[PDB]
Design a protein around this ligand. Structure first.
Ligand SMILES: CNc1cc(F)cc2cc(C(=O)Nc3ccc(C(=O)O)cc3)c(=O)[nH]c12
Length: 198
């Protein structure tokens, strides 16, 4: 029932993305993809477990968000028989707080790395669909969640390149609204970076 329902959700967002992420031509939906993911990292900081969030603009016009929180739980849900991470990355829930599955749905590719309980876990998605169940790839002393997404050029036209200043404005805004949380923005394309703390 869950697999069928998840795919209905991804299909729903694919066909009517204006209802979930916003305008797909003018760049406002493309940048909102970043802010949805960052918002999830801010929830983990507001729970008191994350101190630093790193937002990177990569050269291939993908964006990663890294937190040093406790990592998305990896335990296979007894209920629907897949990692809790995959439930969070794929299940749907106005045009704010839309859930990370929307970003996943409208991403050509999405990379999940979780560090938790001594192990690194990795998963790949294409258009919201897991390539393989979450899997252990190594060990670590660290904790946190890293999400990197390549926006679908099926979904996004005209403004397809992330603009530093637009991410910079909102991240500085988010650090003002959530005192304590530290945010790094880094552009791999030209080396630019900022640090937002209030
Ligand atoms: C870049 N970071 C990031 C991106 C994203 F798209 C989703 C998330 C989701 C969580 C979360 O559910 N954290 C969480 C939930 C439950 C527990 C627990 O029960 O121990 C811990 C952490 C997170 O901590 N970080 C995220």
């Amino acid at each position: 029932s869950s697999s069928i329902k998840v795919l209905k959700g991804l299909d729903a967002v694919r066909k009517r993305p204006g209802m979930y992420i916003g305008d797909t031509d003018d760049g406002t939906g493309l940048h909102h993809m970043v802010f949805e993911v960052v918002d999830n990292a801010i929830d983990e900081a507001l729970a008191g477990h994350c101190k630093e969030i790193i937002v990177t603009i990569h050269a291939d016009n993908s964006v990663s968000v890294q937190d040093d929180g406790r990592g998305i739980p990896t335990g296979i849900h007894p209920e629907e028989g897949v990692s809790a991470a995959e439930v969070i990355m794929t299940v749907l829930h106005g045009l704010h707080g839309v859930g990370v599955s929307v970003v996943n749905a409208l991403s050509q590719k999405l990379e999940l790395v979780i560090q938790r309980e001594g192990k690194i876990h990795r998963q790949i998605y294409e258009h919201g669909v897991p390539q393989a169940p979450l899997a252990v790839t190594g060990e670590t002393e660290k904790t946190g969640t890293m999400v990197r997404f390549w926006p679908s050029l099926e979904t996004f036209t005209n403004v397809t390149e992330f603009e530093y200043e637009i991410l910079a404005k909102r991240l500085r805004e988010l650090s003002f609204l959530n005192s304590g949380v530290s945010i790094r923005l880094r552009d791999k394309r030209d080396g630019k970076e900022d640090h937002f703390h209030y």
